[PDB]
Amino acid sequence: MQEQYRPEEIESKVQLHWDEKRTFEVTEDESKEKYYCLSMLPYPSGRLHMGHVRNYTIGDVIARYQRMLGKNVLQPIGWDAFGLPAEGAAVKNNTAPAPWTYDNIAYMKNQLKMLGFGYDWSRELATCTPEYYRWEQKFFTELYKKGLVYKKTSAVNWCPNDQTVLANEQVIDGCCWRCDTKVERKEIPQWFIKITAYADELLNDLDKLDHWPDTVKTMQRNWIGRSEGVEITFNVNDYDNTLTVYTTRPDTFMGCTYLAVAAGHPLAQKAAENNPELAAFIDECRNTKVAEAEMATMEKKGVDTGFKAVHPLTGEEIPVWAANFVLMEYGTGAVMAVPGHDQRDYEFASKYGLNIKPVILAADGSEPDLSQQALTEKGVLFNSGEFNGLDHEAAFNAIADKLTAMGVGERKVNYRLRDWGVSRQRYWGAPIPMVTLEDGTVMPTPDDQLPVILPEDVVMDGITSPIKADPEWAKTTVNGMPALRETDTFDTFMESSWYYARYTCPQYKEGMLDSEAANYWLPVDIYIGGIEHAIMHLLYFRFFHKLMRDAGMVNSDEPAKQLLCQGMVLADAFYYVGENGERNWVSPVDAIVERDEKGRIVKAKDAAGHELVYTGMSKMSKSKNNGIDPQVMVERYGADTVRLFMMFASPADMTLEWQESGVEGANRFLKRVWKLVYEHTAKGDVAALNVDALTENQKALRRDVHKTIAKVTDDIGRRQTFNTAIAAIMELMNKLAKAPTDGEQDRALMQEALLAVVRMLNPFTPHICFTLWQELKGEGDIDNAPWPVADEKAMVEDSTLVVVQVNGKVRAKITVPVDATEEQVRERAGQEHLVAKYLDGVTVRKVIYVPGKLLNLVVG
RNA sequence: GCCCGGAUGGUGGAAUCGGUAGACACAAGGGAUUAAUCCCUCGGCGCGCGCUGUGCGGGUUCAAGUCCCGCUCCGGGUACCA
Numbered sequence: 043m044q045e046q047y048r049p050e051e052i053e054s055k056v057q058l059h060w061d062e063k064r065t066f067e068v069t070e071d072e073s074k075e076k077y078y079c080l081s082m083l084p085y086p087s088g089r090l091h092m093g094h095v096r097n098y099t100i101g102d103v104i105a106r107y108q109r110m111l112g113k114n115v116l117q118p119i120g121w122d123a124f125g126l127p128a129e130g131a132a133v134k135n136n137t138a139p140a141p142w143t144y145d146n147i148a149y150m151k152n153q154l155k156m157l158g159f160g161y162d163w164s165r166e167l168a169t170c171t172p173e174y175y176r177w178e179q180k181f182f183t184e185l186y187k188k189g190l191v192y193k194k195t196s197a198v199n200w201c202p203n204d205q206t207v208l209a210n211e212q213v214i215d216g217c218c219w220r221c222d223t224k225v226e227r228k229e230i231p232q233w234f235i236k237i238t239a240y241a242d243e244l245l246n247d248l249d250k251l252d253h254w255p256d257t258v259k260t261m262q263r264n265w266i267g268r269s270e271g272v273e274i275t276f277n278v279n280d281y282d283n284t285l286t287v288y289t290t291r292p293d294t295f296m297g298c299t300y301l302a303v304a305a306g307h308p309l310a311q312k313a314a315e316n317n318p319e320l321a322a323f324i325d326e327c328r329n330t331k332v333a334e335a336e337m338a339t340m341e342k343k344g345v346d347t348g349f350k351a352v353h354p355l356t357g358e359e360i361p362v363w364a365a366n367f368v369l370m371e372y373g374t375g376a377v378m379a380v381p382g383h384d385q386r387d388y389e390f391a392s393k394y395g396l397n398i399k400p401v402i403l404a405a406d407g408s409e410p411d412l413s414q415q416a417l418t419e420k421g422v423l424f425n426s427g428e429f430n431g432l433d434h435e436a437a438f439n440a441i442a443d444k445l446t447a448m449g450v451g452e453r454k455v456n457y458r459l460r461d462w463g464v465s466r467q468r469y470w471g472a473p474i475p476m477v478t479l480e481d482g483t484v485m486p487t488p489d490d491q492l493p494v495i496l497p498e499d500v501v502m503d504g505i506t507s508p509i510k511a512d513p514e515w516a517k518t519t520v521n522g523m524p525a526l527r528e529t530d531t532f533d534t535f536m537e538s539s540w541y542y543a544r545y546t547c548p549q550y551k552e553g554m555l556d557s558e559a560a561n562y563w564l565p566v567d568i569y570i571g572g573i574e575h576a577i578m579h580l581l582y583f584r585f586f587h588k589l590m591r592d593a594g595m596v597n598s599d600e601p602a603k604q605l606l607c608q609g610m611v612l613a614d615a616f617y618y619v620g621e622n623g624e625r626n627w628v629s630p631v632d633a634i635v636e637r638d639e640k641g642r643i644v645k646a647k648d649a650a651g652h653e654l655v656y657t658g659m660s661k662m663s664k665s666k667n668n669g670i671d672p673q674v675m676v677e678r679y680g681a682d683t684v685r686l687f688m689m690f691a692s693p694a695d696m697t698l699e700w701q702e703s704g705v706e707g708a709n710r711f712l713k714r715v716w717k718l719v720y721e722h723t724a725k726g727d728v729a730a731l732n733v734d735a736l737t738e739n740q741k742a743l744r745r746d747v748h749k750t751i752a753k754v755t756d757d758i759g760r761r762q763t764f765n766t767a768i769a770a771i772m773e774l775m776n777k778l779a780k781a782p783t784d785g786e787q788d789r790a791l792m793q794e795a796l797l798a799v800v801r802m803l804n805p806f807t808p809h810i811c812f813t814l815w816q817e818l819k820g821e822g823d824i825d826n827a828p829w830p831v832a833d834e835k836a837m838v839e840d841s842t843l844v845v846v847q848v849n850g851k852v853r854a855k856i857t858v859p860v861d862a863t864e865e866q867v868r869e870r871a872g873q874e875h876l877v878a879k880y881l882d883g884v885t886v887r888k889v890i891y892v893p894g895k896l897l898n899l900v901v902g
Numbered sequence: 903g904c905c906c907g908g909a910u911g912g913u914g915g916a917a918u919c920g921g922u923a924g925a926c927a928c929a930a931g932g933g934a935u936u937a938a939u940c941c942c943u944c945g946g947c948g949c950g951c952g953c954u955g956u957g958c959g960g961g962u963u964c965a966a967g968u969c970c971c972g973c974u975c976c977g978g979g980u981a982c983c984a
């Protein structure tokens with residue numbers, strides 16, 4: 043062992059030992075107890091950033107911790123290879139998307155190995171290979187035959203000149219980010235999977251997931267949005283077709299003064315032939331972007347349709363209106379509007395001067411005041427004909443039964459959750475196995491023709507997909523006649539919805555899953571990822587597990603037992619507009635900045651000379667070009683230093699703002715650990731520790747060693763608060779530094795401490811601890827060595843601290859024996875001069891005493 | 903807009919079940935050997951003391967960073983970024 047700590051010589055040597063001896067490669071061992079520690083697989087963007095490093099350091103800490111407890115730990119790593127960013131970069135760099143992705147996988151694999159995460163590299167998966175996507179294609183065709191797949195029309199962003207589908211990200215400030223023209227909605231047929239079939243199952247099973255956080259669960263409940271209500275049907279005067287509308291407040295039905303409808307309705311098109319102003323409004327709604335954010339934020343405009351719907355109960359003609367806020371997707375694409383008891387409809391009725399009818403009494407039983415706002419609260423009916431006097435429950439059922447009896451109404455469970463649309467029209471994705479014959483009939487691709495392989499060797503113009511551009515690729519022969527297979531590709535969430543299952547048997551050529559291997563590992567014990575995936579991915583993740591369960595592939599009802607949603611690693615984001623209106627995102631390292639007195643950014647230039655637009659802090663990504671590469675810091679300070687800093691800076695779940703300051707404390711700390719072991723082991727071997735032959739200084743030191751083990755085991759195991767665990771070890775290291783190591787009992791005690799401390803740091807800093815474990819002469823490799831257990835006899839306290847307050851404010855602190863009564867604490871508290879100062883000339887009104895913790899004397 | 907989080911010294915954070923606010927670190931200042939290491943000071947205002955202090959305004963309690971009511975600002979998601 044050298045005196046100086048040199049990471050460059052140590053770390054690469056230890057990583058080679060793990061690869062050659064195959065330390066973290068594991069099989070389905072029936073003797074050992076299993077632990078599946080899963081981190082979410084990355085998109086191969088190009089470089090890693092500190093967002094990636096935080097995610098995988100957390101998982102490797104848990105995987106190494108659980109390994110030391112004596113369990114067969116599976117920590118897999120793969121690649122979510124398909125995606126949009128591969129296509130844009132391929133055209134820009136003059137390559138195909140396939141080789142761009144494999145080079146990024148090659149680069150990032152090296153970075154992960156250099157960081158030294160104990161992964162099972164034998165179970166590696168690239169989702170862009172046909173070995174992977176063959177089984178989801180096979181699963182999709184099986185899903186179609188069960189009746190869980192269907193085709194329908196859906197709104198899509200469409201740049202009209204180029205004639206290509208754009209994503210939400212590619213639209214910016216109205217116009218399209220490539221060319222100068224406004225983006226429009228286009229109705230296009232697409233494949234959907236019936237996730238709403240499993241709506242109640244996904245919703246109700248959140249109760250069983252007790253080890254998931256309430257942040258994620260409450261978000262999913264509100265996303266699914268189950269809702270029991272009534273679909274009311276209407277007739278129109280000079281129009282044949284009926285208008286059906288959904289509502290959760292049928293009690294307020296007698297106060298319905300008008301009806302609102304979305305722009306893409308048959309009634310709106312019928313009326314727009316004669317009416318020129320309505321025709322102008324419908325063509326304006328093309329510019330409405332496909333996103334809930336910009337749909338709600340815009341001003342709630344509208345125009346009168348002209349047609350008059352007949353209110354079934356009152357018999358009154360009410361005007362139909364067009365509107366922006368009326369979603370085509372949610373409900374029936376049409377609503378009853380009660381402005382008297384809905385804040386959205388009140389604003390609409392106030393603007394355009396529609397009738398505002400009050401039909402619900404206030405809490406007191408008096409008529410409502412609707413001069414300022416609507417009365418959203420539920421109550422007793424008035425101004426409702428026969429339904430007057432009824433409460434909310436009776437009014438709901440009475441108007442439901444009436445409209446059911448009339449035959450223009452029905453009770454229905456409605457979900458906010460829509461069906462999962464999986465058709466994309468880009469190249470770099472798994473092809474959808476569906477075939478349109480010469481007949482005209484559409485049917486699944488047969489089993490002999492699976493997998494429908496995507497051709498990797500291609501050239502891309504940028505506008506159209508090469509598989510779509512070439513008409514020869516689509517050709518095939520099914521049922522003894524020509525046919526055209528689907529050129530649309532899958533959503534990238536499809537590949538990430540079952541990758542966790544495929545890790546159990548990735549080289550299994552027989553089917554989608556080997557059930558012996560799958561049921562051994564599954565369900566997942568801990569699933570670590572971003573809070574960014576709270577809803578979207580995690581809902582598909584769960585949904586897809588239930589489909590595989592119903593297929594008879596897996597036993598468990600839920601895929602993951604525990605979820606650890608780490609906070610986002612944030613960073614500043616800057617950009618300047620290019621020559622042809624293209625957003626060039628500049629990195630914070632390049633950007634020269636002039637700050638405010640408070641800290642906020644005011645101006646923003648770069649090295650060249652562009653006025654950069656500051657878009658606040660945001661998550662690190664290649665999209666906004668604000669990711670910070672760990673390769674510089676790893677080569678400077680070492681992987682262990684980088685890893686330790688990410689865990690020490692903040693607790694896992696909390697959102698971190700990235701900063702370079704703090705890294706030097708981790709490097710200095712590892713030098714202090716190295717120095718203390720160097721000075722200890724240089725003296726030589728040690729004697730056997732006599733437990734009951736120690737001084738009070740030696741007894742107290744050993745108490746702190748075992749108390750740190752109890753804290754660090756709890757902080758990692760239960761709490762996942764790694765910053766408090768690392769801080770607890772830093773305290774113990776400072777006490778061990780000050781402790782003298784002269785005699786036999788001192789060095790015997792120092793052996794026990796250093797063996798414990800090196801084991802507790804092994805999860806965080808595995809490279810340095812592997813080296814130090816051999817120098818302390820421990821049994822075998824540290825990776826397989828057992829986790830330290832605290833001794834209950836060693837941690838016994840003789841006395842306890844007690845704080846002495848006077849009217850809440852602290853005046854004294856005293857040491858008192860553990861087994862001590864309230865009177866004994868009061869007597870000791872009286873002897874203190876700072877306590878007795880505020881007790882003179884005043885009476886003790888009340889005495890509060892927390893056993894062995896606090897005393898608060900309330901004084902007049 | 904809607905849903906879910908966050909705000910604590912110059913800085914990242916600790917206080918685990920309402921009970922000592924600032925552990926453990928970084929940055930800064932000064933000292934001590936002669937880049938590296940070890941010491942000292944470190945929320946604010948006026949001392950081996952007193953008041954005050956956890957984004958802003960109220961409230962409950964013997965006691966509030968923690969619980970309650972009303973806001974501000976900052977982040978995540980918002981169905982084609984992954």
Ligand SMILES: CC(C)C[C@H](N)C(=O)NS(=O)(=O)OC[C@H]1O[C@@H](n2cnc3c(N)ncnc32)[C@H](O)[C@@H]1O
Pocket residue numbers: 081082083084085086092093094096097122535538570571572573574575579608609610611612661662663984
């Ligand atoms: C399952 C599948 C849908 C996952 C998908 N392939 C994916 O997300 N790929 S990835 O490359 O963007 O990320 C991989 C992991 O890293 C986390 N992460 C990313 N950015 C940050 C950040 N700024 N801060 C913290 N964590 C981040 C992210 O949540 C994920 O767990």
Ligand SMILES: CCC[C@H](N)C(=O)N[C@@H]1[C@H](O)[C@@H](CO)O[C@H]1n1cnc2c(N)ncnc21
Pocket residue numbers: 269288289290291294367368369370371372373374375376377378379380383384387
């Ligand atoms: C309180 C007065 C009645 C009120 N006016 C009402 O009918 N509300 C509908 C229902 O009560 C609620 C369910 O979430 O959303 C509304 N709703 C139903 N479909 C849609 C849609 N497509 N778009 C926007 N909101 C909708």
Ligand SMILES: [Mg+2]
Pocket residue numbers: none
């Ligand atoms: Mg602050």
Ligand SMILES: [Zn+2]
Pocket residue numbers: 201204218219220221222223
């Ligand atoms: Zn365009």
